């Protein structure tokens, strides 16, 4: 029937009508007054039942003929004579808008609803979250009027208890008594926190007004909140979210829900608070201004398994304050103080007039409520006692119901409340079991509870003894937390597609993910021989560096707040940040290349740039402390990250601000020098020493101690271990310096162009000249070296070597230049000569003309040599970026060109056959007009000074007007638009070009450590040796053990200085000092007004003691 | 190194395990040259009662702050009992509140015995960076070292138990510093 409520829930009607006690009121003609006023013992009168069965019985006189044997008059029970029926009510009970819209729900169910059915209602149907706290408020109806001061504290404490725990608040529902003060607390401090606060009012379907207006199946009914003057009944409170309405008889009969509300508390406390915690949901009882039936409710909570605790307030003044006074004058669980019962029972009867007879009956309840003091928490207002009742609500669930501190701690873990756990669980004197704090850590890591991981580490948990292999197997294999939906896609990409449905993840599989993300020759510690054998066997079952293992975990599970926390703890801070920058970057690249409805690539790319910024800020901190030791931090092997290097990790991430940072640029500048001391040399001297080999020995070099921060080769280190440096060592130092390899290739390249310019300008005979064979020998041997750069570069995959190398500009240009040369040399050399006149062989012409065009590639390649300079380099990279940026302005200039050329050719040349010359003529002249050529005497072809007098004809007077418009658009609009484009894009392209230039000095300078000594006409001598030693049989930074110790102390010290100066800059800013002033002046305003009230309590005794 | 299991930070420290009959010139030669320590300008030998406990919160801030600003502004050594019972628990919690990585200037030297200390056999080793736990052992009653010290001097007369051998040697250390020139 498209209604889950109708198949399960229940209305119920009083179908069998028993009249009232004896008496109809007045009005002698008795036959009419038995219908007009006589109520049913149901409670409603006889004309409102309508009783489809007994409607045929009311016509006789009524149901059930007369006197009915007085024992049988009482016989109406709601079980026997009150018949059940389907729904009649559910929908939205939207209150008339005050501050906001304020929707809510209702059900109208029976009394005999089973406890499993009512639990099934709240969770599944109404889409509510299973809570972590139930605050059942209880007090007295209709009494009223807290003070203004106490209204703020009890109001604020009830909210911050519920929004920080995600609690249900069970109220009476109706606006009398408690719920008026519960909702006014919601009026003050809402902050739209009804998403987290779910106040559930359990009222009856009785004393509520406008019950017949709520009649309806799936009806969004409006409901008014106007205080009805003539009436005395109660309305619902506007700031509730859900209503449960129970009817036993009818309007009046003010109790049916006391059992059902209490049975609801039993069902929640039997449900698990979380899918990892065996403890059940706690229930607390808050007591405002109370009553006579309240005392039976408080005692019914304490006498139960489990013993639900009770929180009692004071200051309101009723039975609430009786429980405050009775609990106060009482020590631990003995009978009484001195005999002051005439003072107690007198105080009981001033609340409600009992009169010494059953006021004694209240005292047996007051002596059982002073008995269980441990489960009673009184909140004394006026001495800031126990600090904001939300502490005292949550503390009351820890003092009584004796359980382990583990049970106290894991309860706070579900609430996500550390200030209760720090100040009331980790107190002095608390004794802990051996494995309890470890089980708390395992729960807190899965549940993404960062501030508890911080608390458990400070209170004794060691991650070294904690983080085992099977436990870290679990941390990946949880769905009981915020998981990454991307990790399972990464695992199937490295296991070739096999996916069983259960599939507990192994660490052999995670390592294959890390090696896939880090790329290159990265080898994780999971996929090596030592780990696989001890993984088969299952101390050695622990990890040496646990916080390296969890930092990867937090990144792969996309738990950034956990990752930032686990980064600060442990060693190798700048390295872990660069690894994390790479791991998120690779997952961001996999996210785009994957068919998911949730991209989450911009989230990972932001996370990659956060750790990248941390790496730069640690390098800046290390560079300010000591320049030389910071350059060592860039190049020492890490021994926990696949023997990699902080440069190699940042270059792998393409993290430009690290490579462009002034520390790496000093290191790159010093690797360029080699063992030459180019601070006290000159570039004149390096070039001179290439041409004059004996001039090498007059050059100042660097000592072994001036090179401890520079990585070297293995055999280059052997040269340094031994004015030092005898003769044959100084030749190795010179010719293997990258600066020398450069000029020794540059001078050979300039001599190459001088020859290849000579070849192409001078007449070519049949056989090549001596100059031309030197050219061929260069480009051939130059091509071999380019083949060697491809094969022997970085990445094991041969096709991946290809994709990197064709990504640079001049490497693609070299490929076209090398191929087209031998196409040209082939046509040139391998052609049948004529012997009568050259250039009657069109194959030889085509070969020569390729030389004339191929030489452009080799002059533009001088920009490639010019880009080594600090000033010229950024401009060369700038030219390319400006061409790409101005493309669409130039396209517009090309359409304006064709808009003019086509009509000019059409008007001036009306008698043309189809020819490809027409394509030339519509483009040619209008293009040269952009560049200054007006063609002054071809304008106005019918003039006397015209150089085209035969073109004069019909309508050629239009073309001067066309060309006037053309050049206005080209120079005056489009050329000046293009000047303006470059001006206003200059600074941000010059800036980008500086960083790109500085980034790519790494790949440039680290290439010259691997290039041979000898330039590309003579390099073939070096390729023979390279094949000789390979068939027959990069740089590292060496450190002794006392220099690794001094370096690790430097890395640790500079990280400590980083977080201290970061905290000192935040605490000393103007923004933070104003607000801490703001928060203290707020508290001082509270105290002085409250001390100002105490000193007014002093002057009452001044008038007394003056008397 | 007797590196404590990381709480707030790494918190390294040293130890020696020496005798009772060490000559006063030898113990002075130990602290300065070998452990690369600076000769101080103040020695604050704290003394109190073991295992008693629990200062108030208000008095914990003033006595905590005053002991640090005495030591960081003078470059002082603080001589404690070393073990976590009694005084050194309150000396180190002063270091927890107002550290500001000022262990570069603060050199708290704990002189404990090699007796009542737990995990003494785990510290057995020539040039060994040994790990050391700070877990409150429930069944036990013995004392652990305090994590926020920097140097430990450990004197054994008999064995575990026998709670006094260092009272003479700690006092003879104070004689050697007061015979050295402050500058
Ligand atoms: C004697 C006279 C005869 C010849 C004179 C005429 C000479 C003509 C003038 C030519 C201009 C010369 C300079 C070229 C600059 C190219 C820029 C570049 O590198 O772009 C990209 C090439 O990315 C690649 O993957 C390229 C792969 C193959 C090589 C490209 C050949 C282009 C041919 C040119 C066509 C003309 C050739 C016609 C002539 C034969 C760089 O990569 P990316 O953009 O960073 O993205 C890479 C990553 N990705 C792989 C994931 C996408
Ligand atoms: C990492 C990437 C960068 C590296 C790239 C490196 C690879 C570069 C690849 C280069 C290869 C390019 C093609 C070669 C020429 C063939 C095309 C052609 O037009 O041939 C002509 C010459 O035909 C001949 O038989 C004579 C050729 C003599 C040898 C020179 C070409 C090969 C050299 C290559 C050395 C390169 C090796 C470099 C070292 C590895 C055919 O026409 P014809 O015969 O003239 O005319 C016939 C009619 N008639 C007789 C009536 C006139
Ligand atoms: C200074 C350069 C111009 C000079 C020529 C040499 C060019 C040198 C290289 C330039 C780099 C290219 C820049 C980006 C464009 C990529 C390719 C492309 O065409 O894309 C566009 C399609 O194209 C069109 O919509 C128009 C096609 C007409 C081109 C005709 C050339 C006329 C100019 C010739 C000169 C006549 C001179 C007469 C006047 C003096 C669309 O863009 P896209 O594909 O979506 O990509 C854009 C950016 N994105 C990747 C972020 C989306
Ligand atoms: C924007 C709109 C433009 C129009 C679009 C339509 C284009 C249609 C193109 C058509 C060209 C083919 C038709 C002609 C056939 C060859 C014969 C010939 O004319 O030879 C002539 C030269 O010219 C040539 O040899 C041809 C020129 C080829 C380049 C054309 C560029 C086209 C595309 C752009 C590529 C640019 C590169 C960049 C690309 C990225 C030789 O003869 P002559 O010079 O008359 O001299 C006579 C005297 N003689 C006997 C002594 C020699
Ligand atoms: C890469 C970025 C994209 C660039 C954009 C596209 C580039 C433009 C592409 C244009 C296409 C090429 C046009 C020529 C067509 C073929 C010519 C031919 O067949 O014969 C002609 C050969 O003449 C030539 O070969 C020279 C061609 C003129 C030079 C063009 C310079 C570019 C100017 C524009 C640059 C900006 C263009 C703005 C765009 C609107 C001669 O005719 P014939 O019949 O062989 O002989 C006649 C005999 N007679 C000579 C003795 C009288
Ligand atoms: C690949 C890299 C090599 C490295 C470079 C050094 C090695 C190269 C060195 C020398 C090789 C020269 C070839 C040997 C034959 C000598 C004859 C000769 O040249 O006679 C000519 C004189 O011309 C000259 O003296 C120079 C001619 C080339 C111009 C550039 C010279 C400087 C290049 C290198 C130094 C600059 C370095 C700049 C940077 C510091 C006279 O002309 P012809 O020859 O009678 O007539 C030509 C007609 N034919 C062609 C049709 C036959
Ligand atoms: C057939 C096609 C061969 C394949 C082409 C494809 C590329 C092949 C690879 C490379 C190109 C060839 C290598 C150079 C040798 C040239 C040979 C030659 O003919 O020399 C001639 C002169 O030559 C000279 O006097 C100098 C020649 C080379 C000088 C440069 C190399 C020195 C540097 C170190 C590097 C060493 C070289 C590097 C090697 C990689 C002698 O020949 P000839 O006939 O007696 O006389 C010439 C004309 N005559 C008869 C009118 C007088
Ligand atoms: C991957 C690289 C691929 C390279 C492919 C290799 C291409 C090889 C292509 C062609 C081979 C040419 C050999 C001859 C073929 C038959 C014609 C013939 O014999 O002679 C005719 C030649 O006519 C011409 O036009 C010759 C030039 C053609 C090549 C054009 C440049 C291509 C390279 C672009 C630049 C490189 C860019 C590449 C950069 C990537 C006419 O001459 P003849 O007959 O001797 O007699 C005179 C006239 N008679 C007959 C009237 C008397
Ligand atoms: C046999 C006779 C032998 C000598 C003759 C040949 C002389 C030598 C060859 C050429 C001229 C260079 C001489 C000046 C060098 C200055 C040093 C310098 O600072 O270099 C910078 C650029 O280094 C370069 O190499 C820039 C490019 C020049 C070589 C290639 C020719 C392109 C430019 C010209 C083409 C034609 C131009 C148009 C006009 C025709 C690099 O240094 P930096 O960043 O400034 O920082 C200084 C510290 N550092 C050096 C440690 C890095
Ligand atoms: C038909 C008539 C034509 C009409 C006119 C129109 C046609 C003429 C138009 C354009 C011609 C200009 C060509 C250069 C354009 C490069 C653009 C580029 O992408 O550069 C790239 C590098 O490239 C450089 O840094 C270029 C360096 C070499 C200079 C170019 C040669 C010009 C000089 C010789 C000329 C001498 C003249 C005589 C010879 C004939 C940079 O690319 P990017 O955008 O920064 O991308 C981001 C970085 N990334 C690459 C790593 C991914
Ligand atoms: C409109 C703006 C204000 C201007 C006001 C003043 C001007 C009034 C407006 C327009 C004037 C049009 C007529 C003038 C020609 C008189 C001379 C003549 O004969 O010329 C030629 C013909 O010329 C023609 O046959 C005219 C062609 C039609 C032009 C279409 C509109 C042009 C302007 C665009 C639209 C306008 C809007 C444009 C947007 C601003 C010569 O040919 P012929 O006769 O054979 O000569 C003998 C040749 N023979 C000896 C070689 C054999
Ligand atoms: C959007 C833009 C509109 C303008 C435009 O670009 C695109 O549209 C293009 C189409 C081109 C024509 C296509 C076909 C031919 C036929 C050919 O027939 C051989 C004849 C003879 C050779 O001698 C046989 O022997 C001669 C050339 C011609 C007319 C082209 C001329 C240029 C034109 C007009 C181009 C022009 C730049
Ligand atoms: O930062 C770099 C600093 C210096 C150099 C490079 C850098 O990056 C490269 C790059 O990229 C460019 C993009 C656009 C325009 C020019 C370039 C260049 C130029 C270059 O090709 C070049 C010099 N050498 C070879 C040449 C022998 C010197 C190789 C490396 C190279």
CB pair distance less than 8 Å for B6 and A433: no
Residue B182, token pair as written in the block: 């402050």
Report the C-alpha gap between A1102 and A1096 in whole angstroms.
Answer: 10
- Say how many Å lie between the CA of residue A778 and the centre of ligand 5: 35
CB pair distance less than 8 Å for B6 and A432: no
Q: What percentage of chain B's residues is helix, strand, coil (to nearest 5)?
A: 30, 15, 55
Touching check for A684 and chain B: CB below 8 Å? no
Q: Is the peptide bond prior to A667 cis by the omega test (within 30 degrees of 0)?
A: no
A1022 lines ligand 7 (CB under 6 A): no
| Strand, helix or coil for residue A231 | coil
- For this PDB entry, the determination method is cryo-EM
Residues 6+ apart with CB under 8 A from A489: A590, A594
Residue A321 · residue A350 · CB < 8 Å: no
- What is the distance in angstroms between the CA of the first residue and the CA of the last residue of chain B? 30
Give the burial string for A371-405 (b: 16+ CB within 10 Å, else e).
bbbebbbbbebeeeeeeebbbbbbbbbbebeeeeb
Q: In the A/B pair of chains, how many CB contacts fall below 8 A?
A: 34
Touching check for B137 and chain A: CB below 8 Å? no
Experimental structure resolution, Å: 2.4
Report the C-alpha gap between B39 and B32 in whole angstroms.
Answer: 7
Angle of the A560-568 helix axis to the A601-625 helix axis, nearest 10:
20
- Say how many Å lie between the CA of residue A686 and the centre of ligand 9: 11
Phi-psi region of B169 (alpha: psi -120 to 50; beta: other; left: phi over 0): alpha
Angstroms from A330 CA to nearest CA on chain B:
27
Residues 6+ apart with CB under 8 A from A447: A274, A276, A413, A414, A480, A481
Give the burial string for A638-671 (b: 16+ CB within 10 Å, else e).
bebbbebbbbbbbbbbebbbbbbbebbebbbebb
- Alpha-carbon distance values, A570 to A499, A542, A566, A628, B52 (Å): 36, 16, 8, 24, 35
Ligand nearest A952 Cα, by number? 11
Angstroms from B1 CA to nearest CA on chain A:
13
Residue A727, token pair as written in the block: 């003769």
CA torsion, ordered A323, A325, A329, A333, to nearest 10 deg: 0
Residue A1028 has a CB neighbour count (10 Å cut-off) of 10
Probe target for ligand 3 pocket from A880, A891, A926, A978, with the most ligand atoms within 8 Å of CB = A891
Report chain B residues whose CB lies below 8 A from the CB of A570: 6
Residue A1086, judged by CB atoms within 10 A of its CB (0-12, 13-18, 19+), counts as exposed
Report the C-alpha gap between A62 and A44 in whole angstroms.
Answer: 15
Residue A871, token pair as written in the block: 């000033």
CB pair distance less than 8 Å for B101 and A1057: yes
Residue A42 · residue A249 · CB < 8 Å: yes
Instruction: For CA atoms A335, A337, A338, A344, give the dihedral sign.
Output: negative
Report chain A residues whose CB lies below 8 A from the CB of B6: 457, 462-463, 569-570
CB pair distance less than 8 Å for A457 and B54: no
Q: Are strands A242-246 and A198-204 parallel, antiparallel or unpaired?
A: parallel
Residue A162 · residue A196 · CB < 8 Å: yes
Strand partners, A310: A376
Report the C-alpha gap between A302 and A312 in whole angstroms.
Answer: 13
Q: Whose CA is nearest to atom 31 of ligand 8?
A: A846
Report the C-alpha gap between A108 and A211 in whole angstroms.
Answer: 10
Residue A1007's nearest CA partner among A832, A864, A837, A853 is A864
Q: Which helix (H) or strand (E) holds A982?
A: helix A976-999
Reduce the secondary structure of A615-629 to three states and give it as a string.
Answer: HHHHHHHHHHHCHHH
A1020 lines ligand 7 (CB under 6 A): yes
- Say how many Å lie between the CA of residue A657 and the centre of ligand 9: 28
Strand partners, A244: A202
Angstroms from B158 CA to nearest CA on chain A:
31
- Say how many Å lie between the CA of residue A912 and the centre of ligand 12: 13
Report the C-alpha gap between A752 and A775 in whole angstroms.
Answer: 7
CB pair distance less than 8 Å for B5 and A431: no
Report the C-alpha gap between A1027 and A1019 in whole angstroms.
Answer: 13
A895 lines ligand 4 (CB under 6 A): no
Alpha helix (H) ranges present in B73-142? Answer: 87-97
Q: Whose CA is nearest to atom 20 of ligand 11?
A: A955
Residue A224 has a CB neighbour count (10 Å cut-off) of 11
Alpha helix (H) ranges present in A329-447? Answer: 341-351, 359-369, 390-399, 405-415, 418-424, 436-446
Phi-psi region of B11 (alpha: psi -120 to 50; beta: other; left: phi over 0): left
Ligand 11 atom with least separation from CA of A952: 51
Residue B140 has a CB neighbour count (10 Å cut-off) of 9
Residue A687 · residue A647 · CB < 8 Å: no
| Ligand 12 neighbours (beta carbon < 6 A) | A 898, 914-916, 918-919
The string of DSSP codes covering A32-77 is HHHHHTPBBSSSSBGGG---TTTTTTTTTS-SS-S---GGGTTT--
- What is the distance in angstroms between the CA of the first residue and the CA of the last residue of chain A? 84
Touching check for A1061 and chain B: CB below 8 Å? no
Give the burial string for A16-32 (b: 16+ CB within 10 Å, else e).
bbbbeeeeeeeeeeeee
- Say how many Å lie between the CA of residue A887 and the centre of ligand 3: 5
**Phi, psi (5° rounding) for residue A405?**
-65, -30
Place of tokens 């709670």: B163
Residues 6+ apart with CB under 8 A from A1056: B9, B101
Residue A430, token pair as written in the block: 């608390």
CB pair distance less than 8 Å for B54 and A1056: no
Residue A310 · residue A376 · CB < 8 Å: yes
Ligand nearest A872 Cα, by number? 9
Residue B111, token pair as written in the block: 């002189």
Residue A165, token pair as written in the block: 């725990």
Report the C-alpha gap between A116 and A129 in whole angstroms.
Answer: 17
Touching check for B133 and chain A: CB below 8 Å? yes
Residue A902's nearest CA partner among A922, A921, A887 is A922
Residue A486, token pair as written in the block: 């991307």
CB pair distance less than 8 Å for B138 and A1056: no
Residue A171, judged by CB atoms within 10 A of its CB (0-12, 13-18, 19+), counts as buried
Q: Chain-centre distance of CA A195, in angstroms?
A: 21
Report chain B residues whose CB lies below 8 A from the CB of A460: 134-136
Report the C-alpha gap between B6 and A1103 in whole angstroms.
Answer: 63
Residue A990 has a CB neighbour count (10 Å cut-off) of 14
**Phi, psi (5° rounding) for residue A376?**
-115, 125
Helices first, then strands: H and E counts in chain B: 4, 5
- Say how many Å lie between the CA of residue A741 and the centre of ligand 9: 13
CB pair distance less than 8 Å for B6 and A463: yes
Angstroms from B131 CA to nearest CA on chain A:
10
Residue A879 · residue A825 · CB < 8 Å: no
**DSSP label at A705?**
G
Q: Which of B89, B132, B135, B146 to mutate to test the interface with A (most CBs of A within 10 A)?
A: B135
Report the C-alpha gap between A841 and A765 in whole angstroms.
Answer: 12
Ligand 8 atom with least separation from CA of A853: 35
- Say how many Å lie between the CA of residue A773 and the centre of ligand 8: 22
Report the C-alpha gap between B101 and B95 in whole angstroms.
Answer: 10
Report the C-alpha gap between A774 and B1 in whole angstroms.
Answer: 67
Residue B136 · residue B147 · CB < 8 Å: no
Report the C-alpha gap between A952 and A12 in whole angstroms.
Answer: 108
Residue A487 · residue A506 · CB < 8 Å: no
Q: Are strands A11-13 and A83-85 parallel, antiparallel or unpaired?
A: antiparallel
Q: How many CA atoms lie within 13 A of A34 on its CB side?
A: 16
Residue A590 · residue A556 · CB < 8 Å: no
The string of DSSP codes covering A187-216 is HHS-TTGGGT-EEEEEEESSSBS-TGGG-E
Give the burial string for A703-721 (b: 16+ CB within 10 Å, else e).
eeeebbbbbbeeebeebbe
Q: Are strands A310-313 and A376-379 parallel, antiparallel or unpaired?
A: parallel
| Strand, helix or coil for residue B152 | strand
Residue A270's nearest CA partner among A285, A280, A257 is A280
Residues 6+ apart with CB under 8 A from A439: A406
Residues 411-440 of A with CB under 8 A from B: 428, 431-434
Residue A744 · residue A1015 · CB < 8 Å: yes
**DSSP label at A599?**
-
Residue A973 · residue A639 · CB < 8 Å: no
Place of tokens 């006391």: A258
């Amino acid at each position: 029937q498209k209604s889950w409520i109708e198949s399960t829930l229940t209305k119920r009607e009083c179908v069998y009508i028993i009249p009232s006690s004896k008496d109809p009121h007045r009005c002698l003609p008795g036959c009419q007054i038995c219908q007009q006023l006589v109520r049913c013992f149901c409670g409603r009168l006889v004309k409102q039942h309508a009783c489809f069965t007994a409607s045929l019985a009311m016509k006789y006189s009524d149901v059930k003929l007369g006197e009915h044997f007085n024992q049988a008059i009482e016989e109406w029970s709601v079980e026997k004579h009150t018949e059940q029926s389907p729904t009649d009510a559910y929908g939205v009970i939207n209150f008339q808008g005050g501050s906001h819209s304020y929707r809510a729900k209702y059900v109208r169910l029976s009394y005999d609803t089973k406890p499993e059915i009512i639990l099934q209602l709240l969770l599944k149907e109404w889409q509510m979250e299973l809570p972590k706290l139930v605050i059942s408020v209880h007090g007295g109806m209709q009494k009223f009027e807290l003070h203004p001061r106490i209204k703020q504290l009890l109001g604020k404490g009830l909210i911050k208890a519920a929004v920080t725990t995600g609690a249900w608040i069970l109220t009476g529902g109706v606006n009398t008594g408690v719920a008026k003060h519960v909702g006014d607390a919601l009026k003050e401090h809402a902050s739209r926190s009804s998403r987290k606060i779910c106040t559930i009012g359990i009222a009856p379907w009785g004393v509520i007004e406008n019950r017949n207006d709520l009649v309806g199946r799936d009806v969004v009914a409006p409901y008014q909140t106007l205080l009805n003057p003539l009436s005395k009944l109660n309305v619902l409170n506007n700031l509730h979210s859900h209503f449960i309405l129970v009817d036993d008889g009818t309007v009046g009969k003010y109790g049916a829900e006391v059992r059902l509300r209490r049975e609801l508390e039993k069902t929640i406390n039997q449900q698990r608070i979380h899918a990892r915690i065996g403890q059940g949901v706690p229930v607390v009882a808050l007591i405002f201004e109370g009553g006579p039936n309240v005392i039976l409710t408080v005692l019914e909570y304490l006498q139960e398994s489990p013993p639900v605790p009770v929180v009692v307030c004071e200051g309101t003044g009723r039975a609430a304050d009786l429980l405050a006074y009775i609990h106060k004058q009482t020590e631990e669980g003995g009978n009484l103080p001195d005999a002051a019962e005439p003072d107690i029972i007198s105080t009981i009867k001033k609340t409600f007039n009992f009169g010494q007879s059953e006021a004694v009956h209240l005292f047996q309840t007051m002596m059982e409520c002073m008995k269980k003091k441990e489960l009673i928490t009184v909140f004394h207002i006026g001495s800031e006692d126990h600090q904001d009742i939300d502490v005292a609500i949550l503390t009351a669930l820890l003092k009584g119901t004796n359980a382990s501190a583990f049970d106290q701690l894991i309860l706070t873990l579900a609430w996500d409340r550390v200030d209760i756990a720090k100040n009331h669980v980790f107190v002095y004197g608390q004794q802990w079991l051996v494995g309890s704090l470890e089980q708390a850590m395992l729960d807190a890591l899965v549940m993404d509870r960062v501030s508890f991981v911080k608390l458990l580490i400070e209170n004794g948990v060691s991650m070294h003894k904690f983080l085992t292999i099977p436990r870290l197997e679990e941390l990946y294999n949880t769905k009981q937390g915020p998981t990454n939906p991307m990790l399972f896609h990464l695992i199937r990409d490295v296991k070739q597609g096999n996916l069983p449905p259960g599939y507990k993840i192994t660490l052999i599989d995670i390592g294959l993910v890390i090696e896939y993300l880090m790329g290159g020759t990265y080898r994780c510690t999971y996929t090596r021989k030592r780990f696989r054998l001890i993984y088969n066997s299952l101390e050695t079952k622990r990890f040496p560096y646990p916080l390296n293992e969890l930092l990867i975990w937090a990144c792969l599970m996309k738990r950034q707040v956990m990752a930032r926390f686990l980064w600060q703890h442990g060693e190798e801070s700048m390295a872990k940040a660069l690894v994390a920058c790479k791991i998120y970057r690779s997952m961001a690249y996999e996210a785009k290349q994957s068919d998911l409805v949730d991209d989450t690539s911009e989230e990972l790319k932001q996370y990659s740039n956060d750790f990248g910024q941390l790496a730069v800020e640690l390098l800046e901190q290390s560079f300010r402390q000591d320049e030389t030791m910071a350059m060592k931090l860039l190049t020492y092997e890490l021994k926990n990250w696949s023997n990699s290097t902080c440069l190699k990790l940042a270059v792998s991430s393409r993290l430009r601000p690290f490579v462009a940072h002034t520390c790496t640029q000093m290191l790159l500048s010093d690797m360029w020098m080699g063992r030459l001391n180019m601070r006290k040399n000159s570039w004149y001297k390096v070039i001179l020493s290439i041409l004059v080999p004996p001039a090498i020995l007059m050059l100042e070099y660097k000592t072994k101690a001036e090179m401890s921060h520079i990585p070297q080769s293995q055999d280059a280190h052997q040269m340094t271990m031994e004015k030092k440096l005898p003769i044959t060592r100084k030749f190795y130092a010179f010719y293997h310096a990258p600066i020398v390899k450069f000029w020794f290739n540059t001078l050979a390249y300039l001599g190459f162009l001088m020859l290849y310019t000579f070849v192409v300008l001078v007449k070519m005979e049949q056989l090549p000249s001596v100059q031309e064979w030197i050219v061929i020998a260069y480009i051939f041997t130059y091509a071999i070296e380019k083949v060697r750069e491809v094969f022997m570069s970085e990445a094991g995959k041969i096709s991946q070597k290809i994709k990197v190398w064709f990504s640079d500009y001049f490497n693609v240009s070299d490929t076209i230049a090398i191929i087209s040369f031998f196409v040209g040399f082939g046509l040139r050399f391998g052609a049948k000569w004529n012997y009568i006149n050259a250039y009657d062989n069109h194959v030889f012409v085509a070969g020569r003309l390729i030389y004339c065009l191929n030489i452009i590639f080799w002059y533009v390649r001088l920009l490639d040599f010019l880009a080594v300079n600090q000033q010229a380099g950024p401009y060369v990279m700038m030219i390319g970026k400006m061409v790409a940026n101005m493309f669409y302005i130039v396209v517009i200039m090309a359409l304006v060109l064709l808009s003019f050329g086509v009509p000019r050719k059409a008007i001036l040349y009306p008698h043309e056959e189809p020819s490809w010359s027409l394509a030339k003529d519509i483009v040619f002249h209008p293009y040269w007009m952009i560049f200054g050529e007006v063609y002054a005497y071809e304008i106005d072809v019918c003039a006397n000074d015209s150089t085209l007098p035969t073109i004069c004809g019909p309508g050629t007077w239009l073309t001067p007007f066309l060309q006037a418009v053309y050049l206005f658009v080209q120079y005056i609009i489009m050329v000046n638009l293009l000047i303006a484009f470059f001006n206003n894009v200059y600074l941000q392209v010059k800036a980008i070009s500086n960083i790109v230039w500085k980034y790519q000095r790494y790949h440039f300078i680290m290439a010259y450590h691997e290039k041979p000594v000898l330039p590309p006409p003579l390099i073939i001598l070096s390729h023979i040796v390279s094949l000789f030693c390979c068939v027959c049989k990069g740089p590292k930074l060496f450190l002794t053990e006392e220099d690794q110790k001094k370096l690790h102390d430097f890395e640790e010290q500079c990280v400590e200085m980083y977080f201290d100066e970061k905290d000192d800059k935040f605490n000393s800013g103007s923004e933070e000092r104003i607000r801490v002033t703001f928060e203290r002046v707020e508290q001082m305003s509270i105290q002085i007004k409250e001390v100002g009230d105490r000193v007014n309590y002093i002057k009452r005794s001044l008038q007394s003691l003056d008397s």
